[PDB]
Amino acid sequence: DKTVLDANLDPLKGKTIGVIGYGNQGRVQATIMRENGLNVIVGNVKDKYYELAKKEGFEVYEIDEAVRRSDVALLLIPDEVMKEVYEKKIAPVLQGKKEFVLDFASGYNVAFGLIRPPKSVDTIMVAPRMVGEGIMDLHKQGKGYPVLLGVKQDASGKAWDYAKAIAKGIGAIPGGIAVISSFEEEALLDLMSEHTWVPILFGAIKACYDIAVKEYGVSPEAALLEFYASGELAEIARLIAEEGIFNQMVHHSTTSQYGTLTRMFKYYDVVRRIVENEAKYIWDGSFAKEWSLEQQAGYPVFYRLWELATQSEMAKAEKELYKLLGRK
């Protein structure tokens, strides 16, 4: 199938590589690659992270100076401002090149056209799904992790083998796997989650609390303990990742199984409608517009919501409680 379990490491040996950033990924992938036998460099904003980067023994010039030396570049930096940075400090230099290759972590800014490099650069993606620390929590085990790969532009007939070259350049396969996928799919996915089941879950919890308290005379403490103040959810998620989502439930009681299944098959249509709406909203590019404007206005809504959430009853009760249990 489309999967790839291992590949070559040929095109990247003999060239220099441009690593932009020393954050979570940047540091991890960069240390990995240096340890994989390649000549690499770093570009970074000269701050605490730069201290740490030069600390770990990576020569770090300015951004553009790392792009002039390298024939490849990895932009391991945020999604919200990368645009301007590319416009000012990277586009000129890049125009000062002929054969180049650029790879990202996320496809947001590219899939939606906020960044359109020239046709003189093969354009690709390599994206994992962790938060980042798990990857050292796997590398010290000699394992490998799974990732997504994409190609946006090929001016060399070699974008894909460069893709797998990079892949093995970061220690994913062999040991994990590597999926090939457009930029579009990656963004669509990373957003659907952030828009569909996470917020639904949180709202459902909040509603259960509010109801139980204001309509059946219950104590906040008990509600919090039942719903999320206990690590129940964590164990469930672990068992899911290990055994399977459904096979997991065998370790539960029959009553739980019955209720869960019935209600699941009973509410599947509603959430389906919701998911359709949101995925459509995304495929078109509307959310990108919304978010970019919200940046351009001063993050007001962001602010007010961050306020309301914390000033809710549930949060205050959680505060009193976590204090009681010593949890910070």
Ligand X SMILES: NC(=O)C1=CN([C@@H]2O[C@H](COP(=O)(O)OP(=O)(O)OC[C@H]3O[C@@H](n4cnc5c(N)ncnc54)[C@H](O)[C@@H]3O)[C@@H](O)[C@H]2O)C=CC1
Size of the site for ligand X (CB under 6 A): 20
Residue number closest to Mg ion, CB atom = 190
Q: Under DSSP, is residue 101 helix (H, G, I), strand (E, B) or coil?
A: strand
Q: Min. distance of Cβ 281 from Mg ion in angstroms?
A: 16
Q: Does 161 bind Mg ion (CB under 5 A)?
A: no
Q: Does 286 bind ligand 9TY (CB under 6 A)?
A: no
Q: Min. distance of Cβ 138 from ligand 9TY in angstroms?
A: 16
Say if residue 174 is preceded by a cis peptide, omega within 30 of 0. yes
Q: Scanning the structure block, which residue is given the tokens 């910070």?
A: 328
What Rg do the C-alpha atoms of the chain give, in angstroms?
Answer: 23
Looking at the Cβ atoms of 14 and 113, the one nearer to its own copies is: 113
Cβ atoms of 226 and 205 within 8 Å: the answer is no
DSSP state of 169: H
Structure tokens at 310: 């914390």
Using CB under 8 A, which of the segments 39-47, 54-62, 130-138, 159-167 binds its own copies? Answer: 130-138
Q: Could you tell me the end-to-end alpha-carbon distance of the chain, in angstroms, rounded to an integer?
A: 47
DSSP state of 249: G
Q: How far apart are CA 277 and CA 48, in angstroms?
A: 42
Q: Min. distance of Cβ 226 from ligand 9TY in angstroms?
A: 7
Looking at the Cβ atoms of 37 and 199, the one nearer to ligand 9TY is: 199
Q: Three-state SS string across 218-229, please?
A: CCHHHHHHHHHH
Looking at the Cβ atoms of 253 and 311, the one nearer to ligand X is: 253
**Residue-wise over 194-228: b if at least 16 C-beta within 10 A, else e?**
ebbeeeeeeeebbeebeebbeeeeeebeebbeebb
22 binds, among its own copies, ligand 9TY, ligand X, none (CB under 5 to 8 A by kind): ligand X
Q: Residue 246: which region, alpha, beta or left (left: phi > 0; alpha: psi -120 to 50)?
A: alpha
Q: Does 65 bind Mg ion (CB under 5 A)?
A: no
Widest pairwise Cα distance in the chain: 71
> Looking only at residues 188 through 217 of this chain, which bind ligand 9TY when binding is defined by CB under 6 A?
190, 193-194
Looking at the Cβ atoms of 39 and 196, the one nearer to its own copies is: 196
Closest C-alpha to 179, from 245, 125, 135? 125
- Known binding residue 133? Answer is no
Q: Does 283 bind its own copies (CB under 8 A)?
A: yes
Q: Does 79 bind Mg ion (CB under 5 A)?
A: no
Q: How many CB atoms lie within 10 A of CB 296?
A: 8
Q: Does 190 bind Mg ion (CB under 5 A)?
A: yes
Residue number closest to ligand X, CB atom = 23
- Known binding residue 221? Answer is no
Selected from 56, 204, 214, 313, the binder of its own copies by CB under 8 A is 204
Q: Which residues are annotated as a binding site for Mg(2+)?
A: 190, 194
Q: Which residues bind ligand 9TY (CB under 6 A)?
A: 190, 193-194, 252-253, 255-256
Q: Which residues bind Mg ion (CB under 5 A)?
A: 190, 256
Q: Which residues bind ligand X (CB under 6 A)?
A: 21-26, 44-45, 49, 76-79, 81, 85, 105-106, 131-132, 253
